[PDB]
């Protein structure tokens, strides 16, 4: 008995479709929805080459740079370029400290939800041009380039098919929807659509185990053991395939020496996913110890790290990212307002500039306007503050 079926939910990187460099490791300025930052993207491409040719095992990637430069964007691009169905987890370092689960459980969940299984289910699809609508419950005369065979089907399904495009389409899936495209009926009458849907391990654990229940998390070891054995069973028999995904850990310095050991122990395995860390801190103390090392990472692990650096954005790059995000969020904007928003983003932060978009859109919608203007941007800039402004104002208050 085994039943089956975050970042994309908030949609902060919905425009990232692959790395975009291509041209045999040569970055394109526009590419697939990624602008600027050529060196980091090319290093990421070299990382994909290493992963593809099987020479990455035992190593990991680290991404350094100031916040708001696109570390998670580079990770998402690498994950998408690795494979169209590649799982991608994007946890934060502080997240593993939980009231419910221990650090072991949190890191194990993050690891397992990064490795995926592609379940390949060969559903038997009935395709065929409907020469005649047979009445009814009866059969259905379906023909292709092989033969013409009657297939039993319900009366209500016949009533739905008569509404469907006849005779263009009528490519039904077994006990499922009827896809009307065109006359595709070809080859044999009973084809196999091998739906290859990839899910990571963790959804398999939660589905196998126990709405608002998320308000009222540990997975029992027996479930983990049985799934570990039975996934190997499907791999042996051939139903599914195991795909190494990407596990991203933002602000790696918040981890401690007591979990870096777990990272080293776990990633030293065959079915281990690519490990990406991100940090914006230089030399800093290792949590749980007294010594100071670069990036808050112990020296033993750090010697296995491919370190990439992300440079801060410039005028044109920031304007381009703002344009992409506005297009993705169904927001219309003017040129001078775009310049003002770009200036605001470079002055304080790109994430704050992205945050201001929805507020500006709503303040514009309220006055029955279609194009967000510079006045709307200035209004939402006055309403909501960023980190530096609030800290400065209220620290000036706290001077006593």
């Amino acid at each position: 008995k085994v039943p089956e079926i975050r970042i994309e939910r908030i949609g902060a990187h919905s425009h990232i479709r692959g790395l975009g460099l291509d041209d045999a490791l040569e970055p394109r300025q526009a590419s697939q929805g990624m602008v600027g930052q050529l060196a980091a993207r090319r290093a990421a491409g070299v990382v994909l080459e290493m992963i593809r040719e099987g020479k990455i095992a035992g190593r990991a990637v680290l991404i350094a740079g100031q916040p708001g430069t696109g570390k998670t964007a580079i990770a998402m691009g690498m994950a998408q370029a690795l494979g169209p169905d590649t799982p991608f987890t994007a946890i934060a370092g502080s997240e593993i400290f939980s009231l419910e689960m221990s650090k072991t459980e949190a890191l194990t969940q993050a690891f397992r939800r990064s490795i995926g299984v592609r379940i390949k289910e060969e559903t038997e699809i009935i395709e065929g041009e409907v020469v005649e609508i047979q009445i009814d419950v009866g059969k259905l005369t379906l023909k292709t380039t092989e033969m013409e065979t009657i297939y039993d089907l319900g009366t209500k399904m016949i009533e739905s098919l008569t509404k469907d495009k006849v005779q263009a389409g009528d490519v039904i899936t077994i006990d499922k929807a009827t896809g009307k495209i065109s006359k595709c009926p070809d080859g044999e009458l009973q084809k196999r659509k091998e739906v290859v849907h990839t899910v990571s391990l963790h959804e398999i654990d939660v589905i196998n185990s126990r709405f608002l229940a998320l308000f009222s998390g540990e997975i029992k070891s027996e479930v983990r053991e049985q799934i570990n054995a039975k996934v190997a069973e499907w791999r042996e028999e051939g139903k599914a395939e195991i795909i190494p995904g990407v596990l991203f850990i933002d602000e790696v310095h918040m981890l401690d020496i007591e979990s870096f050991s777990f990272l080293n122990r776990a990633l030293e395995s065959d079915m281990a996913p690519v490990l990406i860390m991100a940090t914006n801190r230089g030399i800093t103390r290792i949590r749980g110890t007294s010594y100071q090392s670069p990036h808050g990472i112990p020296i033993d692990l750090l010697d296995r790290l491919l370190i990439v650096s992300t440079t801060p954005y410039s005028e044109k790059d920031t304007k381009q990212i703002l344009r992409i995000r506005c297009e993705e969020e169904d927001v219309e904007m003017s040129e001078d307002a775009y310049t003002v928003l770009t200036r605001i983003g470079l002055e304080t932060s790109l994430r704050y500039a992205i945050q201001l978009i929805t507020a500006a859109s709503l303040v514009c919608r309220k006055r029955k306007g279609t194009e967000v203007q510079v006045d709307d941007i200035k209004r939402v800039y006055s309403l909501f503050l960023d980190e530096s402004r609030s800290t400065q104002y209220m620290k000036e208050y706290q001077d006593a």
């Binding site: 009231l99 419910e100 994430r351």
Partner: protein, 408 residues
């Protein structure tokens, strides 16, 4: 059904708040529904409310950064009142998560369950009518409806509840037919004057029968549900029954507002729990309140973050600042508080109380209203005067000045 388990002490101070007070254009009129002044934060609060209405706040949260006594809790209560009729509101401080007898998980558990609410709606054949006659005997009472005046046998407890609601002849009120309970809804339009209209505080004759089929709506929170059952199993069985109710179609889940004051005193594990709870389709709009700047996160050492919030969660947060009240506004807030408390006070006493308020805080001036009233009553007066306020301000001190005096 069940009672309410809302800590009214934390809300009683903010009792004059009846919403945010914005016009159609969203501008602040500087005086509406109790709130006075603080236009910028009120406009931002209205924008937040509009975002909540259109479900654009998928996981984003609100943070209010300002000095103590600048209306952060008042703004949160105003948001909670603006989001609907009786959207639940559960204010809390971070310090409560540190309890010697209950785990932090249980505290955050309960304070989350107090925030999201349930509107139960059900059509009942209740005794909705006008009290034409009252004969307490077995309390034979005449209720007039679209049918006519019907004589009903009630209990003395029901008549006592009717007295509690202060009901006179000619009031459109429903008395429960299944159990028996009087809840005042309004008066009757049979005895309506010019200024009393229908579908308002005056209600016309209840259409139908004395057993009128009316859609009763009761506002509850799951915390009252858990305390209704005289453990995780209890919460789970409430979970399933609520799920059954919502699939049935007689229940509606509304997201409330969860106010978190003194955010800097939450452990970094509590922030992770809050982030995990902010990830659900149904969840309260978590509003943080901060008055400490770049602070060390509890649970970690030698790390500094804005407002003591980890950079993981804090990036999903909007920041609204609350400015300090001016003396002219100071007087208006303190006057509103005094008027709502029924404490008559003179103009010069109001001036001096405003000076005291701009000296140290506003909560201090607010608590310095009952002692002044009692000192006035003892002296043999009815209204507080300047001398009384000066005497009561000399007798009692605030924390800052008391610590300063004790330092010397």
């Amino acid at each position: 059904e069940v009672k309410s388990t809302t800590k009214t002490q934390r809300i009683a101070s903010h009792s004059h708040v009846k919403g945010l007070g914005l016009d159609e254009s969203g501008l602040a009129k500087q005086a509406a529904s109790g709130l006075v002044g603080q236009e910028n934060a009120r406009e931002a609060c209205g924008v937040i409310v509009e975002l909540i209405k259109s479900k654009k706040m998928a996981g984003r949260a609100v943070l209010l950064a300002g000095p103590p006594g600048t209306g952060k809790t008042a703004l949160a209560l105003a948001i909670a009142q603006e989001l609907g009729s009786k959207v639940p509101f559960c204010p809390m401080v971070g310090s409560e998560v540190y309890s010697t007898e209950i785990k932090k998980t249980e505290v955050l558990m309960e304070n989350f369950r107090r925030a999201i609410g349930l509107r139960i709606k059900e059509t009942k054949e209740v005794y909705e009518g006008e009290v034409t006659e009252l004969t307490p005997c077995h309390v034979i009472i005449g209720l007039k409806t679209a049918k006519g005046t019907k004589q009903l046998k009630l209990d003395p407890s029901i008549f006592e509840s009717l007295q509690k609601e202060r009901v006179e002849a000619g009031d459109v009120i429903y008395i429960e037919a299944n159990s028996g309970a009087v809840k005042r809804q309004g008066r009757c339009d049979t005895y309506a004057t010019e200024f009393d209209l229908e579908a308002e505080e005056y209600v016309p004759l209840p259409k139908g029968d004395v057993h009128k089929k009316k859609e009763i709506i009761q506002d509850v929170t799951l915390h009252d549900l858990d305390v209704a059952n005289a453990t995780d199993k209890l919460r789970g069985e409430i979970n399933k029954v609520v799920n059954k109710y919502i699939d049935q179609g007689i229940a509606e889940l509304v997201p409330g507002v969860l106010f978190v004051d003194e955010v800097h005193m939450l452990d970094i594990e509590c922030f992770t729990y809050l982030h995990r709870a902010l990830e659900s389709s149904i969840a309260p709009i978590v509003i943080f309140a901060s008055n400490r700047g770049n602070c060390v996160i509890r649970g970690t050492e030698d790390i500094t973050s804005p407002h003591g919030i980890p950079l993981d969660l804090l990036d999903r947060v909007m920041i609204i600042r609350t400015m300090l009240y001016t003396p002219q506004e100071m007087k208006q807030i303190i006057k509103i508080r005094a008027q709502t408390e029924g404490i008559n006070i003179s103009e010069e006493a109001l001036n001096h109380l405003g000076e005291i308020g701009t000296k140290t805080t506003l909560r201090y001036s607010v608590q310095l209203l009952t002692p002044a009233n009692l000192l006035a009553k003892i002296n043999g007066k009815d209204s507080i005067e300047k001398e009384h306020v000066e005497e009561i301000s000399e007798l009692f001190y605030d924390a800052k000045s008391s610590a300063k005096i004790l330092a010397d």
